[PDB]
Amino acid sequence: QVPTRKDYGSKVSLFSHLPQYSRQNSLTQFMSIPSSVIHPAMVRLGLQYSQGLVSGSNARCIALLRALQQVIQDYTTPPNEELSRDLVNKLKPYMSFLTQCRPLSASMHNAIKFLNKEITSVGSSKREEEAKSELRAAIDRYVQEKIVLAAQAISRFAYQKISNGDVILVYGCSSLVSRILQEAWTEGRRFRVVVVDSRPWLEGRHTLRSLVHAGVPASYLLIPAASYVLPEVSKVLLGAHALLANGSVMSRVGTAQLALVARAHNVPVLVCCETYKFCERVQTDAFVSNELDDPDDLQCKRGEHVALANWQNHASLRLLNLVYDVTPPELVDLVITELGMIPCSSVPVVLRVKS
Amino acid sequence: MNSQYMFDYPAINILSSVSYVAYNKFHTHDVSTYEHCEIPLEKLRLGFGRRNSLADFYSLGELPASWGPACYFSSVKPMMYTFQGMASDLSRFDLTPNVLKALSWPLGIPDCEIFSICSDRFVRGLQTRDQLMSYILRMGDSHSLDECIVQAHKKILQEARRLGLSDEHYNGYDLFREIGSLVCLRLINA
Amino acid sequence: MDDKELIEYFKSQMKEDPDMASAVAAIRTLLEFLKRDKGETIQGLRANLTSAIETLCGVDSSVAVSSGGELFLRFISLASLEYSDYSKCKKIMIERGELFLRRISLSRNKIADLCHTFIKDGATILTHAYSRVVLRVLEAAVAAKKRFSVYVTESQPDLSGKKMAKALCHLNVPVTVVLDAAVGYIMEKADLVIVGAEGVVENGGIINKIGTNQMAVCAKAQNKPFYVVAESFKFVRLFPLNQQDVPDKFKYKAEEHPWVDYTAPSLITLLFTDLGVLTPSAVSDELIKLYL
Amino acid sequence: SELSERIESFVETLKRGGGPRSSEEMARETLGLLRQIITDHRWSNAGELMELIRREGRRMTAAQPSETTVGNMVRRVLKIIREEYGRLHGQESLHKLLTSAQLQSNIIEAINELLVELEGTMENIAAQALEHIHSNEVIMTIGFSRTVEAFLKEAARKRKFHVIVAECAPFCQGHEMAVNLSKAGIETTVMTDAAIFAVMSRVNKVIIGTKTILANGALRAVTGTHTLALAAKHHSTPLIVCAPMFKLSPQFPNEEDSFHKFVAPEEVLPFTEGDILEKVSVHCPVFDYVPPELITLFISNIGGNAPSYIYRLMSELYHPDDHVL
Secondary structure, three states, X not given: OOOOOOOOOOOOHHHXXXXXXXXXXXXXXXXXXXXXXXXXXXXXXXXXXXXXXXXXXXXXXXXXXXXXXXXXXXOOOOOOOOHHHHHHHHHHHHHHHHHHHOOOOHHXXXXXXXXXXXXXXXXXXXXXXXXXXXXHHHHHHHHHHHHHHHHHXXXXXXXXXXXXXXXXXXXXXXXXXXXXXXHHHHHOOXXXXXXXXXXXXXXXXXXXXXXXHOOOOEEEEEHHHHHHHHHHOOEEEEEOOEEOOOOOEEEEOXXXXXXXXXHHOOOOEEEXXXXXXXXXXXXXXXXXXXXXXOHHHHOOEEOXXXXXXXXXXXXXXXXXXXXXXXXXXXXXXXXXXXXXXXXXXXXXXXXXXXX | OHHHEEEEEEEEOOOOOEEEEEEEEEOOOOEEEXXXXXXXXXXXXXXXOOOOOOHXXXXXXXXXXXXXXXXXXXXOOOOOOOOHHHHHXXXXXXXXXXXXXXXXXXXXXXXXXXXXXXXXXXOOOOXXXXXXHHHHHHOOOOOOHHHHHHHXXXXXXXXHHHOOOOHHHOOOOOHHHHHHHHHHHHHHHO | OOXXXXXXXXXXXXXXOOOOOHHHHHHHHHHHHHHOOOOOOHHHHHXXXXXXXXXXXXXXXXXXXXXXXXHHHHHHHHHHHHOOOHHHHHHHHHXXXXXXXXXXXXXXXXXXXXXXXXXXXXXXXXXXXXXXXXXXXXXXXXXXXXXEEEEEEOOXXXXXXXXXXXXXXXXXXXXXXXXXXXXXXXXXXXXXXXXXXXXXXXXXXEEEEOOHHHHXXXXXXXXXXXXXXXXXXXXXXXXXXXXXXXXXXXXXXXXXXXXXXXXXXXXXXXXXXOOEEEOOOHHHHHHHHXXX | OHHHHHHHHHHHHHHHOOOOOOHHHHHHHHHHHHXXXXXXXXXXXXXXXXXXHHHHHHHHHHHOOOOOHHHHHHHHHHHHHHHHHHHHHXXXXXXXXXXXXXXXXXXXXXXXXXXXXXXXXXXHHHHHHHHHOOOOOEEEEEOOOHHXXXXXXXXXOOOOOEEEEEOOOOOOOHHHHHHHHHOOOOOEEEEOHHXXXXXXXXXXXXXXXXXEEOOOOOEEEEOOHHHHHHHHHHHOOOEEEEOOHHHEOOOOOOOOOOXXXXXXXXXXXXXXXXXXXXXXXXXXXXXXXXXXXXXXXXXXXXXXXXXXXHHHHHHOOOOHHHOOO
């Protein structure tokens, strides 16, 4: 049986319903070196999630789907059994272990749902090798037409909204935004880009390193100084990790703050995302369901001391570093998908048309 | 996205023929039309206005939505091209000295189907698109159709200015008409 | 026909019945062009139609003409998908266009019947400028034996507010003409605001005469309802981000005199169309369903 | 005959006083009554059945327009006949404009499955309740409504939080929720209406029920709900409405102003005052109109939804022709 991960540190009272794991503690200590309970692809993928080697939502979904393809190729049905439900029953513990390594995201949840619906739809008369080949082809087709073509269409649509000489503000690291900016610059547009980052991931330096390599003029600053630069900003472009049915945008921690400050400065806000990230569940805030990262990441060596070195030694001291937060629909103007540019409140409609 | 809708998709192959497949759905890129033929603007942009001298479009990287005789409202200022008489005269002449390398151009190899294309007894119908598009692809050196069209137009302009043929009198309203006129004139020369 | 019977026929249709909107006349002219097409190709047919779109858009460049043209283009594409042969599909295009004209000719009556309930007795309506839909709705309300007052702005760039005030006082309704600058002064007396629309954008906002936005903004300050009456064919897949994002071919040509501005959907309470009574977010859905 | 007298008894009960207090009981009784109406009355074509249903629903609605569960259940049934007739013989949108005798058993089974799914709306709401309440939250409700009480008293099985209940004067039925919910160990508080804003700053989110939800997303609730929603919007606290699917009715606010329900002014002002009761006019409405701009979310037996999407649920429940009934 797969052991459970132990919580590290004392959690905030409001977040007692969420887990909090340390990066040092990995489940592999209590697993057989030749993987028997779970497939080696599953344990490798969980290891490279729990260690933070894969961060982007698209990257996480792609890696999960590739590992699932590996498992499907390696799968063999048992006698007196059929693939249709045995495959799902075998897959469930793998998803549980993956959640144990790190909580699932919207992209992975949608991918799991789609794969379950595809496997359940596999006819009983199908042959094992033919069924495996069909599942592999379906996964490849889903990846292609739900990431690559979606990104191309989104970039083409967003090209129109970008005019010459304007200033565009981005936030964090996101493949879709970087691709949009690079393709817009390549097509002939001339503009500056303002990059906003935040502690402790500091993932913005990712996309910045891309923009400099594309020749795009750029500017860099931390999130608190955004109010200083928003007067000269014309458009705001953000990446969304999830779109909720009520129009709320479930994204990185600083997204809602930047949207609020931009709205206060009277600057339009743009959001580009793929349809496969549209969830059906809703949440009104960032407290009911969120993610607690490693609290030790908050420590920063300023001067010659780390002010939060032995933070556990203070009984009444708690550390809190969310990973996600929710932006209300009123602070958003666009949702840019392969379907086109739609209002932020049209998310449920798409949810209906994709089924 | 009405400008992005498609009816027939041009499938290409590389003796450099072009087919049409039934494709009744919106395309990922804007499409222009010319003589019942559809060209996906996969690497260019759409144009506007009734400006003459079609070269002025792709010089900006754009390409007009529609033009040519099939368009009742051609935006490239249609004009006469008073050279199709010799095209009809030589239409029934088949493939079999100076004339060989005279008509090797503009393709660089002898070719006679151009006269049949420019012949009067050849209606610009829906069934003729295949041979027209295949010829325009073969006579160009690219993969997407719009680069083939622009290559054709600039090669026509190059050959016209080679003999000093009043490039102003050659806009590109009906590409194959200029093809036939140049072939007839250079066959008259040799 | 070719580029001369188009404009003349469109103007004749507009002038013979001046109580009929520009978009309806444009759609009827497009149908007439389709009738006398004398060409046998679907691709060429759509090319000629889309050329007719901007040769008609040269005059009376209001957004309604463009919306009607886009609707006609989507209709002819939809029909083609349904069938296969230009020959046979031509007559079905013609009959579908006739039925479409018949259905859209009742939009005013349907909107009036739907919307007359929203006026209270003793109410005070506020109006920006002339719009036949508003006049029809108020006529329906009068036919219901209701009592109310009407304040109308004067629409300074062209004094059409006075024209609609004359047309309304012809109906024995107590009306009051006010300056375009007096809106903030006046609306505190107004019980609710009803305006027309020259086009509906993706999110739900409207595209209307220059003053409209101001009223809407002031309305949001006064917590008063803001109702917009517009037909179905006034939908378009345009999404301005701000006032300067709407295409300049609509702002000008009917030291800086625009003619049309955009109002965000957040300031709109309800849309009254021939499709029914909709929330501002509904329109996108409908306009999405047209292209899926 | 017997069905006719049962219908008359039902109408008299609605006119005088609601016997079955819960709205779910109203829905079940209305659907059952429609079932005997369909089985007993004779009809050849579907048109006469539809007009008979129109007449009966008109009578029942005219008995008491204050509550609309009967009306929209009748409209749902009418849509059921419309769908079955279209299926066995063969939605307004731009697509429609541009493009262009054995059904009794099907109707009966449709009504039966509708009753079956209506039975478990409370259970589905309770099942999805746990995803909107976090530990040590502060929740405020108004009046009495079984949906939200089941919601909270089951979601507290794995969480601990504080609940504030404001008595819905004059019908101080919030005390009933307070007692019932404190009988489950939730650490609740009993409060008057006049203090709502006074405490509204220190509340994380507010969950309320409703009596009827209109097409535009605006709803009709107990008196004082509009003030609570206004305070919520002022403090920007999210507002959750827990309403089963049958509480969705397709009318609109401005309809003859027979919207509220005025009861005897005895509750507000006792009869013992005496002489001053002549010159003084007293009003005691029991319902208030909450606009859709102050609503954040809708929780129903099918899940979460936004107010801006409510119109779509109208198209999937009620045919446009049957709004007038």
